[PDB]
Amino acid sequence: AALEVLFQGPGNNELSPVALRQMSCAAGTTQTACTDDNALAYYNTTKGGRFVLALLSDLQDLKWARFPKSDGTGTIYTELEPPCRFVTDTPKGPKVKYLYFIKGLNNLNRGMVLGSLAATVRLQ
Amino acid sequence: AALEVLFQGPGNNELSPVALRQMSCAAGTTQTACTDDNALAYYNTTKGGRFVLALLSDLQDLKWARFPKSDGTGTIYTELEPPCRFVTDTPKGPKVKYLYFIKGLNNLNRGMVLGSLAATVRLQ
Numbered sequence A, B: 001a002a003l004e005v006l007f008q009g010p011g012n013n014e015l016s017p018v019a020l021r022q023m024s025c026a027a028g029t030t031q032t033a034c035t036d037d038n039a040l041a042y043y044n045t046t047k048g049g050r051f052v053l054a055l056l057s058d059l060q061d062l063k064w065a066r067f068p069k070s071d072g073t074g075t076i077y078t079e080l081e082p083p084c085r086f087v088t089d090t091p092k093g094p095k096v097k098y099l100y101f102i103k104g105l106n107n108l109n110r111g112m113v114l115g116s117l118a119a120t121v122r123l124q
């Protein structure tokens, strides 16, 4: 989907990539409005479980997002940032999608995700 | 080949990608060691001048890089951060390269450079 990077190697200087799997999830404008899969979330397969960076959806007033926990023993709601507007070439017609960074995600990851999206998916 | 994304809309919530140009520069252990071109810098064409985000290069021990003023009035020596090490895959072999960021480059851009890089190029 979109390949981030991590500083590994003996001196914490080797660049190893990491692809990012994606999955569906629920978003809404409040916590109860998250009732149905209206969004695509970019995550990373860690050891503590699954860690979410940003959200991709057609709606523009979204504020929240709904995820099972690791092994779905409960449920988590994370606030989204104000959305980034862009235009991708979906294979069914050019489509306006919005990008939501999870609130808290740091700038270096915000930038890896963008330049990974700028290079891979076609923007406009 | 390394793109970068800018937020530039009516409310600056608008994703706009920009291709970063490149050029050969001179670098070295210290300011005076900078003589011959031994690296490649990535830059962005603003109005008024050029902005160098990072150097790519075969040598470590690069602490400095030198740049002309574009007007003739002189030269500019920028200090480099510690290098990130990474390995691509030329047909000659594994090519060890050393990626330098400019001291002060904000983390957001570091991410865009790195995520832009890990997709386009063939990291292992």
Ligand SMILES: *C[C@H]1C(=O)[C@]23[C@H](O)[C@H]1CC[C@H]2[C@@]12CO[C@]3(O)[C@@H](O)[C@@H]1C(C)(C)CC[C@@H]2O
Residues within 6 Å of the ligand: A007, A012, A013, A014, A108, B081, B082, B083, B084, B085, B101, B107, B110
């Ligand atoms: C690969 C290099 C790199 O990008 C680092 C260092 O220069 C070196 C290893 C660790 C990186 C930092 C500190 O400086 C960096 O240039 C920088 O991009 C990293 C930040 C984002 C500031 C924080 C993690 C690490 O300390």
Ligand SMILES: C[C@H]1C(=O)[C@]23[C@H](O)[C@H]1CC[C@H]2[C@@]12CO[C@]3(O)[C@@H](O)[C@@H]1C(C)(C)CC[C@@H]2O
Residues within 6 Å of the ligand: A081, A082, A083, A084, A085, A101, A107, A110, B007, B012, B013, B014, B108
């Ligand atoms: C597209 C969204 C976006 O990415 C924004 C917003 O949440 C929204 C619009 C602008 C950026 C951001 C403020 O918050 C952001 O999360 C952040 O990435 C931006 C910076 C890096 C802190 C600086 C520019 C800007 O102030």
